[PDB]
Structures are given as C-alpha cells and as structure tokens.
Amino acid sequence: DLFTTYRLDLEDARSKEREELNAIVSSDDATAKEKSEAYDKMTALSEVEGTEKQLETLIKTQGYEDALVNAEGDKINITVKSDKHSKSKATAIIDLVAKEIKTMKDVAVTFEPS
Amino acid sequence: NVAMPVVDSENVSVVKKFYETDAAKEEKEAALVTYNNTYSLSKGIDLAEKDGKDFDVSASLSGTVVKAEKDPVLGYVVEVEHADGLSTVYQSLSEVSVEQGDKVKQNQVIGKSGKNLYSEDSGNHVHFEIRKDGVAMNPLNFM
C-alpha cells in the first residue's frame, strides 16, 4: 500500500532519530549540557508528533479514511487516502493547516488512490 | 524599483498568483501548483504570453547570480542575490544566458521561458519569486 508504506517509513525515520538522540543521552562521553540538548530535541519532536496527530484527526474529519502529516520541516507534507482529487479538496485541507499553523511556508497535499 | 522580469511587458500576463490564505477561495484554488496527484502552494507568480510561446526573461532589480542550472523538476532555474537579504528567482526557464558568479544589471536578459513539471496546459511560462532571507513574498506587492 503506497500510502501505508509512506506511514511505516516515516515512522522509521522517527524511530531512528528517537534512537540516535537516546544514544547520546545514555552515553558517557556526552556532557550533561550535551545530554540535555538531546532531551530538548526529543521533547520538540514529540510536540511535532502531537500536532501531526491533530491535523490528521481534523482531516479525516471530512471524508478521508486515512491521513498522514509530516510537519517536521518548513514545508508540511500531507498524504491522504483518496481516489477523487481536486483543487477544491486541496484547499479545504490547506485551509485548516493554515488555521492551526503560522510559521508555515509551503504545504503539499498528495491524494493517494487505494 | 522592482522590474517586471519580462522584456516585452505587454502581451505577457500573470497566469498564476501568489497563494494567500485569507483570500477568496477559488482564487486560492487558482494559486495551487500541481503535478500528478499532488498539490502545493504557488510561492511566486507565473508569467506567460497569450497563446503560449517562449520569450526572454529579463532580470528584475540587479545584482550577482547565485545559481544557474537545470533542475529535473523545475526546468531551468536562476537565482540572483540582491541587497540585504533580498533575492529573486526565475524558474521553468527553457535556457539560461548566464552562469553562477555573473554580475547582472536589471532588465538584462536571461534565458527564455520554458516548461517544468508544474506546467499546466501547453506552456511555456516563467516562475518568479522574491525572497527576504529566503522567505517568499507576493511579487505583485512590489509591482
């Protein structure tokens, strides 16, 4: 499932950072300032994951049996499960990303067919 | 003093605007750029001749060229840096008249208009952007 593998390997991206940060925080040769900066990053990442979660939720809320949001970067990538797709649909989606985010540079919605 | 980046400024019209949320929908819809199944925001404006046809792409206000090249997605792209964080961008070119490092003067021609993945219809067009410290702004607010 082109969608579902999109999800799975975004979660690997995320599982590998989670892992790399923890590598530092449990190491001897990292200073307690260095160890904290790592923690800070884990925290920030989790915040990101919780907003992605809300946007997917709000998005599935108008049709869309599934949604996948990557808000990490400057450009926010959105993947949705849809056979139908239009300039109309995209705006409805973009519209509500704007309303939950300023700081927002570009948005890219992909409607992936089942 | 921001130059419309087209030598012949008649017959060349803006076919796509800079996407503004908090703007009428359907003009938002006309500010989307798209390829295959995916839609994105227009970060600049798109210029083009009625009927479609190529044409020369003049620099907007002058300065040094930071980038010139083909991008598989964007066609031919040139970037020109300017004073205090400003830069302009020209994409979907069919070719380029300069190389990185070239000093350029406003209204100095560069490559003609072209196509890239985002072309809808039969092309061609130029994509133009203005950026303050890398952030894109509505180029029409400078014209």
Short mmCIF file of C-alpha atoms in Angstrom, two decimals:
data_model
loop_
_atom_site.label_atom_id
_atom_site.label_comp_id
_atom_site.label_asym_id
_atom_site.label_seq_id
_atom_site.Cartn_x
_atom_site.Cartn_y
_atom_site.Cartn_z
CA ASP A 1 0.00 0.00 0.00
CA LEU A 2 1.85 3.08 -1.30
CA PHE A 3 0.17 5.10 1.43
CA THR A 4 0.75 2.65 4.26
CA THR A 5 4.44 2.30 3.37
CA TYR A 6 4.57 6.11 3.43
CA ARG A 7 3.43 5.83 7.06
CA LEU A 8 5.72 2.97 8.01
CA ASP A 9 8.88 4.61 6.72
CA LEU A 10 8.05 7.97 8.22
CA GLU A 11 7.84 6.05 11.46
CA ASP A 12 11.27 4.56 10.82
CA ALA A 13 12.66 7.99 10.22
CA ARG A 14 11.13 8.91 13.55
CA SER A 15 12.26 5.71 15.29
CA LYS A 16 15.84 6.30 14.17
CA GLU A 17 16.03 9.90 15.46
CA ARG A 18 14.35 8.80 18.69
CA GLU A 19 17.12 6.17 18.83
CA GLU A 20 20.03 8.49 17.89
CA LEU A 21 19.07 11.09 20.46
CA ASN A 22 18.80 8.42 23.16
CA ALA A 23 22.21 7.13 22.08
CA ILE A 24 23.63 10.46 23.26
CA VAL A 25 21.67 10.77 26.44
CA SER A 26 22.78 7.35 27.69
CA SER A 27 26.45 7.77 26.62
CA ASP A 28 29.35 8.59 28.99
CA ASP A 29 31.25 10.92 26.70
CA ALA A 30 28.36 13.34 26.25
CA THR A 31 28.36 16.21 28.73
CA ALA A 32 25.32 16.96 30.86
CA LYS A 33 24.74 20.06 28.74
CA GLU A 34 25.04 17.91 25.61
CA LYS A 35 22.78 15.31 27.20
CA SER A 36 20.17 17.94 27.91
CA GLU A 37 20.15 19.40 24.41
CA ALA A 38 19.27 15.87 23.24
CA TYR A 39 16.33 15.66 25.65
CA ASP A 40 15.22 19.07 24.42
CA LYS A 41 15.11 17.65 20.89
CA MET A 42 13.11 14.60 21.86
CA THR A 43 10.66 16.93 23.50
CA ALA A 44 10.35 19.15 20.50
CA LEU A 45 9.91 16.14 18.25
CA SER A 46 7.08 14.80 20.38
CA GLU A 47 5.34 18.15 20.17
CA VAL A 48 5.59 17.85 16.40
CA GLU A 49 4.12 14.32 16.52
CA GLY A 50 1.15 15.57 18.52
CA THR A 51 0.28 18.30 16.04
CA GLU A 52 0.62 15.89 13.15
CA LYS A 53 -1.84 13.77 15.14
CA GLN A 54 -4.36 16.58 15.44
CA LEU A 55 -4.14 17.57 11.85
CA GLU A 56 -4.66 14.01 10.68
CA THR A 57 -7.63 13.82 13.03
CA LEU A 58 -9.21 17.08 11.81
CA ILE A 59 -8.51 15.98 8.22
CA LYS A 60 -10.06 12.51 8.43
CA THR A 61 -12.98 14.57 9.74
CA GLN A 62 -14.09 15.49 6.23
CA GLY A 63 -14.14 12.22 4.28
CA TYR A 64 -10.62 10.74 4.03
CA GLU A 65 -10.45 7.29 5.62
CA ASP A 66 -6.78 7.98 6.41
CA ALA A 67 -4.33 10.87 6.61
CA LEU A 68 -0.60 11.25 7.18
CA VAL A 69 1.07 14.55 8.15
CA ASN A 70 4.75 15.39 8.31
CA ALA A 71 5.07 18.80 9.97
CA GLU A 72 8.73 18.48 10.90
CA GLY A 73 10.14 20.58 8.12
CA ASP A 74 9.41 24.06 6.83
CA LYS A 75 7.19 22.58 4.11
CA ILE A 76 4.44 20.39 5.57
CA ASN A 77 3.75 17.21 3.59
CA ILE A 78 0.26 15.71 3.79
CA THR A 79 -0.73 12.35 2.36
CA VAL A 80 -4.38 11.40 2.15
CA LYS A 81 -6.27 8.27 1.04
CA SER A 82 -8.49 9.36 -1.83
CA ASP A 83 -9.43 8.18 -5.29
CA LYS A 84 -11.03 11.52 -6.01
CA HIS A 85 -8.80 14.59 -6.03
CA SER A 86 -9.23 18.29 -6.91
CA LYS A 87 -8.03 21.86 -6.36
CA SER A 88 -11.17 22.06 -4.27
CA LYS A 89 -10.23 19.28 -1.90
CA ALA A 90 -6.66 20.51 -1.52
CA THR A 91 -7.72 23.94 -0.36
CA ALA A 92 -10.07 22.54 2.29
CA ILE A 93 -7.01 20.75 3.61
CA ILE A 94 -4.50 23.54 3.26
CA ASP A 95 -7.12 25.91 4.75
CA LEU A 96 -7.15 24.09 8.04
CA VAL A 97 -3.40 23.64 8.22
CA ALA A 98 -3.06 27.39 7.95
CA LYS A 99 -5.56 27.86 10.73
CA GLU A 100 -3.65 25.54 13.06
CA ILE A 101 -0.21 26.82 11.99
CA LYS A 102 1.57 30.10 11.34
CA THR A 103 5.32 29.79 10.68
CA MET A 104 4.06 27.82 7.71
CA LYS A 105 5.98 28.21 4.41
CA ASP A 106 4.68 25.62 1.92
CA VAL A 107 2.12 22.79 2.09
CA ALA A 108 1.96 19.75 -0.14
CA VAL A 109 -1.12 17.53 -0.20
CA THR A 110 -0.92 14.24 -2.10
CA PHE A 111 -4.15 12.26 -2.61
CA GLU A 112 -3.07 8.66 -2.82
CA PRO A 113 -5.51 6.24 -4.53
CA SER A 114 -6.38 2.96 -2.77
CA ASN B 1 12.01 49.79 -8.09
CA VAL B 2 11.20 46.11 -8.86
CA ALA B 3 11.28 45.20 -12.55
CA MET B 4 8.62 43.01 -14.10
CA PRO B 5 11.01 40.32 -15.32
CA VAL B 6 9.86 40.26 -18.91
CA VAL B 7 11.37 42.37 -21.69
CA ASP B 8 8.09 42.90 -23.54
CA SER B 9 5.69 43.72 -20.75
CA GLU B 10 2.63 43.81 -22.97
CA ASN B 11 1.17 40.50 -24.20
CA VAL B 12 2.75 38.91 -21.15
CA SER B 13 0.25 38.37 -18.37
CA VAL B 14 0.25 36.91 -14.89
CA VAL B 15 -1.38 33.49 -15.17
CA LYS B 16 -0.86 32.35 -11.58
CA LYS B 17 -0.77 34.38 -8.37
CA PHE B 18 1.00 34.07 -5.00
CA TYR B 19 -1.17 31.94 -2.73
CA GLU B 20 -2.79 33.96 0.07
CA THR B 21 -4.88 32.21 2.65
CA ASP B 22 -7.43 34.65 4.00
CA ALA B 23 -8.31 35.31 0.38
CA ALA B 24 -11.37 34.32 -1.62
CA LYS B 25 -11.39 30.61 -2.20
CA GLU B 26 -11.26 29.63 -5.86
CA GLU B 27 -8.55 32.23 -6.17
CA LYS B 28 -6.78 30.09 -3.62
CA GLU B 29 -7.69 27.20 -5.85
CA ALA B 30 -6.08 29.13 -8.72
CA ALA B 31 -2.96 29.66 -6.58
CA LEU B 32 -2.27 25.91 -6.34
CA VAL B 33 0.56 24.34 -8.32
CA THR B 34 0.13 20.67 -9.15
CA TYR B 35 1.65 17.53 -10.64
CA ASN B 36 0.15 14.06 -10.76
CA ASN B 37 -1.82 13.55 -7.55
CA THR B 38 -0.15 16.28 -5.58
CA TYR B 39 -0.98 19.95 -4.96
CA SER B 40 1.19 22.66 -3.44
CA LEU B 41 1.18 26.45 -2.93
CA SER B 42 2.33 28.87 -5.55
CA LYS B 43 5.24 30.70 -3.91
CA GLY B 44 5.54 33.31 -6.65
CA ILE B 45 3.80 34.37 -9.84
CA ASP B 46 3.72 32.73 -13.29
CA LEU B 47 4.09 34.92 -16.40
CA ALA B 48 3.13 33.99 -19.97
CA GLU B 49 2.16 35.13 -23.47
CA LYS B 50 -1.39 34.71 -24.69
CA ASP B 51 -1.44 31.55 -26.86
CA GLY B 52 1.65 30.33 -25.01
CA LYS B 53 5.05 30.92 -26.60
CA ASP B 54 8.58 31.42 -25.45
CA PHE B 55 10.08 34.80 -24.65
CA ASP B 56 13.08 36.36 -22.96
CA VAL B 57 13.29 36.61 -19.19
CA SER B 58 14.80 39.89 -18.04
CA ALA B 59 16.29 40.27 -14.61
CA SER B 60 14.34 42.23 -12.02
CA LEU B 61 16.43 44.58 -9.95
CA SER B 62 20.15 43.80 -10.41
CA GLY B 63 22.96 42.00 -8.60
CA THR B 64 25.06 38.82 -8.62
CA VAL B 65 23.92 35.37 -9.83
CA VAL B 66 23.92 32.78 -7.05
CA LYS B 67 22.65 29.87 -9.16
CA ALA B 68 22.14 28.78 -12.77
CA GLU B 69 21.27 25.23 -13.83
CA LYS B 70 18.75 22.63 -14.91
CA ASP B 71 16.61 21.05 -12.23
CA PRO B 72 14.79 17.98 -13.45
CA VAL B 73 11.60 19.19 -11.64
CA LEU B 74 11.85 22.96 -12.13
CA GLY B 75 13.32 23.21 -15.62
CA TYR B 76 15.99 25.87 -15.94
CA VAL B 77 16.43 27.88 -12.75
CA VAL B 78 18.46 31.00 -11.98
CA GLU B 79 18.76 32.78 -8.68
CA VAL B 80 20.02 36.31 -8.19
CA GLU B 81 21.00 37.71 -4.82
CA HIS B 82 20.41 41.39 -4.01
CA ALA B 83 20.84 43.91 -1.21
CA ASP B 84 20.22 42.98 2.42
CA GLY B 85 18.65 39.51 2.24
CA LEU B 86 16.73 40.06 -0.99
CA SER B 87 16.78 37.59 -3.82
CA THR B 88 14.76 36.86 -6.92
CA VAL B 89 14.17 33.53 -8.55
CA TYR B 90 13.37 32.54 -12.09
CA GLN B 91 12.29 29.01 -12.82
CA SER B 92 10.75 26.93 -15.59
CA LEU B 93 13.25 28.51 -17.99
CA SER B 94 13.97 26.90 -21.37
CA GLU B 95 17.62 28.02 -21.12
CA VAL B 96 19.94 30.45 -19.37
CA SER B 97 22.15 33.34 -20.55
CA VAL B 98 24.48 33.42 -17.54
CA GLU B 99 26.46 31.33 -15.11
CA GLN B 100 26.99 31.47 -11.39
CA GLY B 101 29.13 34.43 -10.38
CA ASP B 102 27.92 36.60 -13.26
CA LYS B 103 27.21 40.17 -12.18
CA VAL B 104 23.92 41.31 -13.73
CA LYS B 105 22.07 44.54 -14.36
CA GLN B 106 18.33 44.94 -14.09
CA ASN B 107 16.41 44.19 -17.30
CA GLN B 108 19.45 42.32 -18.58
CA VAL B 109 18.04 39.32 -20.44
CA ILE B 110 18.37 35.72 -19.29
CA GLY B 111 17.09 32.52 -20.83
CA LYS B 112 13.71 32.25 -22.49
CA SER B 113 10.57 30.89 -20.85
CA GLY B 114 10.15 27.13 -20.60
CA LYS B 115 8.24 24.26 -19.06
CA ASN B 116 8.77 22.15 -15.94
CA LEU B 117 6.68 19.57 -14.04
CA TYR B 118 4.27 22.20 -12.92
CA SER B 119 3.31 23.43 -16.36
CA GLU B 120 -0.38 23.00 -16.84
CA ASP B 121 -1.65 23.26 -20.43
CA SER B 122 0.94 23.61 -23.25
CA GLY B 123 3.31 26.21 -21.78
CA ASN B 124 5.54 27.93 -21.70
CA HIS B 125 5.92 30.26 -18.73
CA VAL B 126 8.36 31.65 -16.23
CA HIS B 127 8.07 31.23 -12.48
CA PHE B 128 9.19 34.22 -10.47
CA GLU B 129 9.74 34.70 -6.75
CA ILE B 130 11.10 37.32 -4.33
CA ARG B 131 12.56 36.28 -1.01
CA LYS B 132 13.66 38.18 2.09
CA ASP B 133 16.16 35.96 3.82
CA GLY B 134 14.75 33.02 1.94
CA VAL B 135 11.08 33.74 2.76
CA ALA B 136 8.83 34.21 -0.28
CA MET B 137 6.58 37.24 -0.66
CA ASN B 138 3.85 38.21 -3.06
CA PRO B 139 5.78 39.55 -6.01
CA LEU B 140 2.78 41.69 -7.03
CA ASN B 141 3.21 43.77 -3.89
CA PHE B 142 6.40 45.00 -5.49
CA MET B 143 4.72 45.86 -8.77
#
